[PDB]
């Protein structure tokens, strides 16, 4: 069982057959560098037709003195480190200048050409500071929030986007905007939640691999990528910066009121954690390659720091809940065994994991502490690790899926964590949590997040992003990481004590 | 009491009262920013005497334009982020430009000024690309050794040092060169071992707190930090980048044949793991502060990845170990005396941690498995285990280090593996490895590491660093971290079955 939901997760965005037409995509044979593919916008950008290019060697169109470094670079195994290449394209006698961005993927050498001449300046001083002072602000951040604020302020200052946010995925791949830097121009998304389908699963899978994408304007005609005969199979554009993006996302950006967009993957343990997401409300945003990779660099630094800076918000605790634990075990070894065990130190047991009641059961006698579910009628609870093979700390809040006799018997307080303690599943330590009922602020209605069109209706994005408060029924207060390993620490140190059973 | 605190370990290296004279140290009163200390080398570097600086407010000597931004930066609570400060020092006619490095320690505002030289788009972009490429090369490393190799290559490329090593500390705080990048003509230090007293414990503890240090030339006259009347106590220079270093380290570097140095602390679990150590054979290396902190950042990233990169190693052996664990667990449970379950897998139990001998002591009671009885005067190691902090898993390269009677048996250099089961000092399993008589290559004679070259009350170091081989007994071949984790996992499985129960 995965995720796995709607028809959003299936359009193949990585082979649209087309690019964003402000640059030119070529692919080159190896080792000859014969153009086997070329986007059809080549007349405007390069002054040659796609059919003038297909079949010719790259060096034909290149100014003679730049042929050697350019061709040596393109033969290199070190492509990513060499980008951007200086390409000087010569048609008739005219020299045009481009950033060349080359990569290899799925057996194809792809070369993308973004014009480098007549564009805006990129002040050196601001680039210099965003990189050097950005590195030092991120290193010196004391918690996740400070790390996020530094990123969005540096990336906004470096790019000039109207809005740069940190967008953090949750366990169900919905996200929320946890930091925002913005021109007063633009509406705050800070605090808003967005449904998982805004960034469907095949997009998340692409973005775990290609950590940057830019749409300098959502208003463009895709330029087809033409191929020589016998090179007509779909060209994998997974790692091409000009890849034309899914029209359903381009429609979504129109409905949101954004004209240009750029986002950078945030990674943790090889998994997509979130995005740095930049949007322009009015106007285009043709961010040059060098600026983009400075933003990618800040995103890699933040990524490398993600696990550290969030753990820092718990080092204050832990040692608290660690010396708590060392008192509960100080009081099972010198004292009873386990019986009136953590029961005499009950607000150490429930200050261990912040619950309103416990529930033990060495074939007891159970033993609440208190206002547990039903007390008497909870004998349908003490079996549940005997259903899924896990041994195993069951830790939930929405008991509306795994045992929703929180609906055919409700109760509320249905916020449970339970670990087991012996082999043939019998005895159980349960912590319950009362109901902290919460308003979650969504951007537009999350239940109508996908729309259906015709006529066997196709897929369209929602049209309103107006704030939409959801009163969430079912859920407790979140099991911050420690309620499991602090419970894991307790489970095993009590098996230790329990083994003086063999007194 | 363990290791170590001897005579080298006592020079107060944090209060030399003097700095390295290529930059100037100031300390500024708060909130008034009056100069209360200043290093006597001010005339060459700054253009005035300490006599003029002391008593005067910092804004006097600062360019009028950047006066207020500089003072605001220095009154900020958050100085680390702001470094390097742009200090435009004005003395009548000339502006002199400095990197300002400010910090607070022991209640003093310390500002250190290093002559800056100005940055150029080329090679800032090149430096930026190297740091970005360096960062992703660390995150991409496939195991520990290759993270080490990547670090020394990146750091040497960034700094231009003749040599950069990873120097790793062992249990007794001796060190070893485990990775090196160098100009090929320089002698390879790779493989050399060095005694703990080369980096004595007050240095090691300072370096646990201040992670970066550079000696741009070992030939310098320390400049005294003068002070106003009434601040004449020793100024704690723990965190100053210009702090004058211990004279016995300088002459060590002289005897080693190096002219400049720079090192980066490597931290793991809050303890000094090693150094990134950079050396120049001839000539100086005034590495700019920007380049230095980029190297320190790469060291911080390496430190964050040490455990993860080691966890990647021995991929197949881990799956093998997990197999034995299942087969071992399977038969304690299918069985009378669960202890006999593992006794019947000499093959299984010994391979789990790649040992040639094991002993299980439980409720009595020793049964020995491998060719490693140490004879059944065994009841000595077992019993000594019955002290200590028996949980979790105890492990040593060299059993003599913690248990000096271990010298008497050539069958258990290792070193164990492992652990106590039922907490009470009662019941253990032990694994043994044979001893691999090997040569350790020291650089210089480690028994004359503190040579008295005259030589009464003063301390002097080695004059010779020539390779000095030594045959070592009682060291077993290191335990892999996956073998420790297998030992801990089996321990939790044995205690599960032991609790459970009757039949
Ligand atoms: C089922 C179809 C889709 C519906 C319905 C929908 O809402 N999106 C669908 C498909 C889709 N989206 C994207 C790419 C994408 N989406 C986002 C979402 C956000 N942008 C914001 O500013 C915020 C919050 C403030 C959210 C949430 C983002 C960031 C992206 C990445 C591209 C970008 O940065 O603009 C794709 C993939 C598009 C492609 O790569 O071709 C698809 C198929
Ligand atoms: C007891 C006195 C000392 C003797 C004897 C000795 O040999 N050193 C003594 C004191 C001492 N050393 C240091 C700092 C230090 N030492 C090293 C050692 C090495 N440099 C190398 O290149 C290698 C291996 C190839 C080793 C081993 C290092 C790296 C350092 C850190 C300084 C630096 O990086 O150059 C101190 C503290 C010096 C200070 O900070 O003032 C002292 C007191």
Numbering used by the authors:
A (entry chain A), B (entry chain B): 11 to 513
Article excerpt on this structure:
The SaBphP1 and other myxobacterial BphPs lack a conserved histidine (His) at position 289 in the GAF domain. SaBphP1 contains a threonine (Thr289) at this position, which is replaced by glycine in some myxobacterial BphPs. The mutant PCM also crystallizes in the dark in the Pr state in P3221 with three subunits denoted A, B and C in the asymmetric unit, but the PCM-wt crystallized in space group C2 with a single, dimeric BphP molecule in the asymmetric unit. Interestingly, the crystallization conditions for the PCM wild-type and T289H mutant are the same, yet they crystallize in different space groups. Indeed, the r.m.s.d. between the T289H mutant and wild-type PCM is ∼3 Å overall. As shown in Fig. 5(b) and Table 2, the PAS and GAF domains superimpose well, but the PHY domains occupy different positions. When this His is absent, as in the SaBphP1-PCM-wt, the formation and stabilization of the Pfr state is impeded. The resolution achieved with wild-type SaBphP1-PCM (2.25 Å) is the highest so far reached for unmodified PCM dimers. Hence, the SaBphP1-PCM crystals are perfectly suited to reach the near atomic resolution range (∼2.5 Å) in TR-SFX experiments.
